[PDB]
Structure 1
Amino acid sequence: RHMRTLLIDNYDSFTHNLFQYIGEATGQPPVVVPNDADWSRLPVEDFDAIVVSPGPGSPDRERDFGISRRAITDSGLPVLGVCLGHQGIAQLFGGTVGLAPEPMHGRVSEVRHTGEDVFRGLPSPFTAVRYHSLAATDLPDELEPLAWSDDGVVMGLRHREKPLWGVQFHPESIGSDFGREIMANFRDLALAHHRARRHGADSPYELHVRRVDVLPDAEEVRRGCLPGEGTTFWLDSSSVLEGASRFSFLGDDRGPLAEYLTYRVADGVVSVRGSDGTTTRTRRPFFNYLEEQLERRRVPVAPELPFEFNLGYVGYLGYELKAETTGDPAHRSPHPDAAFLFADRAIALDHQEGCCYLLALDRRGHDDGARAWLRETAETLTGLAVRAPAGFGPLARARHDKDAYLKRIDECLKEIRNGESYEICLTNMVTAPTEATALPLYSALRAISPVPYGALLEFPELSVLSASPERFLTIGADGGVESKPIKGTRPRGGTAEEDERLRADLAGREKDRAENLMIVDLVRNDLNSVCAIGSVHVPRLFEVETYAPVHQLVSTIRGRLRPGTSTAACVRAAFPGGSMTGAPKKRTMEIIDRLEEGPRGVYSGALGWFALSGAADLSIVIRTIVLADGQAEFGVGGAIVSLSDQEEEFTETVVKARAMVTALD
């Protein structure tokens, strides 16, 4: 779907220039309607956004618009007023407007701004043409300024409650810059507002929130608040970097409204274990079941929380769920194809601000002891902060040995010779017996490799010990999407200067840049299938990030979901991660199936949370140990392209194992 944009026309003064820019920016032309039109007769319904073109036109028609102003001002739809006059401003905004110190018509102004809403991503200053020599100083308390001119007057504003915006310039004038970006921004605002439109069904839950101004050691929170045995989760920002990673999340299945949930690809059945102990087996595809439950259990985000996870499902998506995306069911995993804890109670650590947030659900109209838990857990955390404030290994066994792996790379190099793939992510699977238990082994791992997306899942069937640095999908409740595919890996150096050498090498090597580039294109394709035209872009390209085990080459891709596209639907379209398959995904996954001679399981999948607000945050499962039956499984791999040497790419798989192997030792 797409937004239906209504463009109000005033004597066709500038209407068709606005037409052009909206069309180019959004890929969808607006519907043009005169300012004399009957708004009651007109189906304002369907129209998701309104743009009000300026005059001057007829004195009569302008007066008629004013008589019927409330059709637009109190309609509830996003509105953008484009450089309106004294009367146009009084009608739509209701403010006072005088003559400007530099009162030229068609004046070229420099506009400085806060970078908010319609001004998102614009440089400050930027050039813009002002037609009306009318501009405000005093604003009513209901109106907030967003931007100002070089002659000290308001160039942009918004109403603090209603989705109304005003620009006191012409974005679409030839003498203006970033006109198309301003119209795309307004389109994006319209998508957010439409997504926030609840209606639907009454929320079955009642979220309760308490902040606690203490921050204990996260492992101590694991030991202090969670059970020694039982099904738990710990989303672990073991590395904390401003703008990169900030929060940790812990919880268990002890709560009354908690559920444990699993899927098998062979069966196609969801298993939901409630608090009763009773497990229920309904049959429908996983992403399909997940969407319905996320829609059913929808809870508004609590704006007091600085994070988006307002409780929901926490777990992993296995690689074999590809069978329900664009892949084939070639190999059955030894582990569940998905597994999530539906968390009704959770501890959130704010590593930035040095406080905790406690989330708990009651059923609507019921007291299930949420507030009792909040009060109780707060007391525990307070006491806890006082005690503790904040090759493959000797017995390891690769699925493919060196000789077998080299032959499989050769196969990959023939595949790329024949044009059947542009890049194959060939991965291996290593198994080793261990006497270690989950928490001690994870304690070792997180010390070795602090990362933004660390995780310890302790489930009945398995334990997942992730030291992933890689962001698969961060999806806002507003429907904004970000993916940061990694491809291009360098081992750390011995000395400081050796490090800087490998840093420089990774960023500048043609080979690596091509690997990354092709994945960026692939991820862009996936996002475009579910995102609005004009929304997909690449803010950063070929950035090197450094972590304890490796240097990594990372690119950032953003987009905004189409209207009616759920978060689950977005994840389906992008799963499995392009960074873990290759280009083109489908054909490259067929090749993966044949060559790997076995399943990946949780490796190469996604691990994270789906929230009841609609938000989500998912990592790629790399640098991860799966713990089950005294066995330790970990997957490793690397990009195969036409330039690829075999032995270097095998050695790469060994290097990516350092963390997991060091921890198991």
Structure 2
Amino acid sequence: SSIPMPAGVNPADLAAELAAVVTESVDEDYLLYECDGQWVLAAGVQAMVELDSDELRVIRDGVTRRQQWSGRPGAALGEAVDRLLLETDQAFGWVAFEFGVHRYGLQQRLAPHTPLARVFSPRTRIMVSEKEIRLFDAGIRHREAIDRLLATGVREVPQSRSVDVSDDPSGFRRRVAVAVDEIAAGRYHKVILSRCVEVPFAIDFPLTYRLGRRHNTPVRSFLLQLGGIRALGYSPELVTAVRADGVVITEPLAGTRARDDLESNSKEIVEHAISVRSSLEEITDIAEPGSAAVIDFMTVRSVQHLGSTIRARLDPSSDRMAALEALFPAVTASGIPKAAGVEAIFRLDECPRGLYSGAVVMLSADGGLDAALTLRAAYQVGGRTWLRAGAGIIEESEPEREFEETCEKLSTLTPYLVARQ
């Protein structure tokens, strides 16, 4: 069913307000995913797939089926998610940074019960765009919430509450210096290290999402309440998109400014070129021979970046999870060469990273996959609320400038935190 979107109603506001009110009223988890002008609210859990380092669980109708798994995490997750998609048209969820370590032989360094992915089939889907609201399997209470919201309008967003991000309790400056020393010793070229920032008060996730969305222009965005986790984020990069017709895309970004300097700066050009070569090598491993190409190489995309589009056709011997695995973790938030960068993050960052630098995903029964890189995000789990931001460290990096860069990335969220109502 479809309802015309009334004039003067912003889709991000309506979708986040609908997520807040209806799911609390009917007692269900949800994931809201913004993708190319559609805010897709996946509400309620028909079935849940939980992939951990040491176990895979599928939970349906209150019953959990547990199993041991070995080999590639993408194969284990893909087999279970393909079964979900025999019964529903789409599945949604998140994939941890730790999902990408098996490829590099680092699986044995994960602690027991480390989460790798959470993917669910929803009971209801509501898609909100500037044009209309589309309803899929929406029952009486979900339809009544949409009607009430169109009559009452969205809530006014309250004033935000400040947070101090100047302290360094995790020793980010010291950790950057260790990475700089390893890079000078030739261990690797670049690594992204990060720091958590505790938010000392509880936040309202849907209101914070709406407020931050007015001041960010992301490639994708999300807001979720799933299995005891709340999270929201303004993803700056597409990890991968797989279409039903088999076309695979990845759009790495490297080099940033607040245009002539960025396009002529040797440091930005080298970092971009190296990322593009890495993505092309990874995509070529899952692609039909001769189908991989760089389209719009090193073009300029409040920040401006150098960007490239890598496109290929998925090989009939491969699949969307093998494509996600091949491109995971993203270079943008891991390092170069990837294997040494990922290994360095185990030693020099607070692990497990969990959602941070992993992905939020939307899968479709026709073979589609849309995976956004999780950065510029906030999380709440077990009574703890936190932000997390990092910076790419190269041989010339200085700990003080890198700490300042994390402050700049945190500023996408720190002025927009709405305290719990």
Task: Label 1:295 to 1:459 Cα distance change in 2 as closer, same or farther (>3 A).
Answer: closer
How far the C-alpha of 1:395 sits from its partner, in A, is: 7.3
**Which amino acid letter does the alignment assign opposite residue 230 of structure 1?**
E
Aligned counterparts of 1:406 and 1:380: Cα–Cα separation in 2? 48
Which residue in 1 is equivalent to 2:2? 211
Which residue in 1 is equivalent to 2:95? 317
Mapping of 1:77-476 within 5 angstroms?
A: 210-214=1-5, 217-228=14-25, 229-236=27-34, 245-253=36-44, 258-265=46-53, 268-274=54-60, 276-284=61-69, 286-298=73-85, 311-329=89-107, 330-332=109-111, 336-351=115-130, 354-360=131-137, 373=138, 377=142, 381=146, 384-388=149-153, 393-394=163-164, 398=168, 400-401=170-171, 405-476=172-243
Task: Label 1:432 to 1:568 Cα distance change in 2 as closer, same or farther (>3 A).
Answer: same
**Which amino acid letter does the alignment assign opposite residue 170 of structure 2?**
H
Aligned counterparts of 1:470 and 1:654: Cα–Cα separation in 2? 19
Task: Label 1:326 to 1:359 Cα distance change in 2 as closer, same or farther (>3 A).
Answer: farther
Deviation track 1:531-569 (CA, whole Å, cap 9, x = no partner) reads: 122211111233333x4xx33332221111111211111
Residue 527 in structure 1 maps to residue 283 in structure 2: yes
Aligned counterparts of 1:457 and 1:325: Cα–Cα separation in 2? 28
Aligned counterparts of 2:379 and 2:320: Cα–Cα separation in 1? 27
- TM-score (normalizing by structure 1): 0.56
Task: Label 1:378 to 1:664 Cα distance change in 2 as closer, same or farther (>3 A).
Answer: closer
Aligned counterparts of 1:374 and 1:541: Cα–Cα separation in 2? 47
Deviation track 1:551-600 (CA, whole Å, cap 9, x = no partner) reads: 33322211111112111111112111122112211122122222225321
Answer with 409-418 or 461-470: which moved more.
409-418
How far the C-alpha of 1:623 sits from its partner, in A, is: 0.3
Aligned counterparts of 1:455 and 1:612: Cα–Cα separation in 2? 21
Deviation track 1:470-517 (CA, whole Å, cap 9, x = no partner) reads: 111111011111111122233x4xxxxxxxxxx443333221222222
How far the C-alpha of 1:655 sits from its partner, in A, is: 0.7
Aligned counterparts of 1:327 and 1:463: Cα–Cα separation in 2? 31
Asked whether the 8 Å contact 1:312–1:344 carries over to 2, the reply is no
Aligned counterparts of 1:569 and 1:648: Cα–Cα separation in 2? 37
Task: Label 1:477 to 1:511 Cα distance change in 2 as closer, same or farther (>3 A).
Answer: same
**Which amino acid letter does the alignment assign opposite residue 293 of structure 1?**
A
Q: 1:659 aligns with which of 372, 395, 412?
A: 412
Residue 483 in structure 1 maps to residue 256 in structure 2: no
Task: Label 1:224 to 1:650 Cα distance change in 2 as closer, same or farther (>3 A).
Answer: closer
Which residue in 1 is equivalent to 2:158? none
Aligned length: 402
**Which amino acid letter does the alignment assign opposite residue 446 of structure 1?**
R
Which residue in 2 is equivalent to 1:29? none
How far the C-alpha of 1:253 sits from its partner, in A, is: 1.6
Task: Label 1:295 to 1:465 Cα distance change in 2 as closer, same or farther (>3 A).
Answer: closer
Task: Give the number of the structure whose alpha-carbon radius of gyration is greater.
Answer: 1
Deviation track 1:237-278 (CA, whole Å, cap 9, x = no partner) reads: 5xxxxxxx2211002226xxx11332222xx2122232x322
Gaps of 5+ in 1: 1-209, 238-244, 301-309, 361-372, 493-502
Asked whether the 8 Å contact 2:17–2:206 carries over to 1, the reply is no
Residue 507 in structure 1 maps to residue 279 in structure 2: no
Asked whether the 8 Å contact 1:299–1:613 carries over to 2, the reply is no
Task: Label 1:272 to 1:571 Cα distance change in 2 as closer, same or farther (>3 A).
Answer: same
**Which amino acid letter does the alignment assign opposite residue 64 of structure 2?**
T
**Which amino acid letter does the alignment assign opposite residue 116 of structure 2?**
D
Aligned alpha-carbon RMSD (Å): 2.9
**Which amino acid letter does the alignment assign opposite residue 349 of structure 1?**
V
Asked whether the 8 Å contact 1:485–1:520 carries over to 2, the reply is yes
Which residue in 2 is equivalent to 1:632? 385
**Which amino acid letter does the alignment assign opposite residue 346 of structure 1?**
R
How far the C-alpha of 1:615 sits from its partner, in A, is: 0.3
Asked whether the 8 Å contact 1:511–1:643 carries over to 2, the reply is no
SS in 2 for 1:337: strand
Higher relative contact order (Cα pairs below 8 Å, separated by 6+ residues):
2
Aligned counterparts of 1:234 and 1:597: Cα–Cα separation in 2? 28
Asked whether the 8 Å contact 2:238–2:373 carries over to 1, the reply is yes
Gaps of 5+ in 2: 155-161
Aligned counterparts of 1:297 and 1:509: Cα–Cα separation in 2? 48
SS in 2 for 1:219: helix
Asked whether the 8 Å contact 1:311–1:344 carries over to 2, the reply is no
Asked whether the 8 Å contact 1:327–1:590 carries over to 2, the reply is no
SS in 2 for 1:234: strand
Asked whether the 8 Å contact 1:234–1:248 carries over to 2, the reply is yes
Aligned counterparts of 1:530 and 1:517: Cα–Cα separation in 2? 21
- TM-score (normalizing by structure 2): 0.85
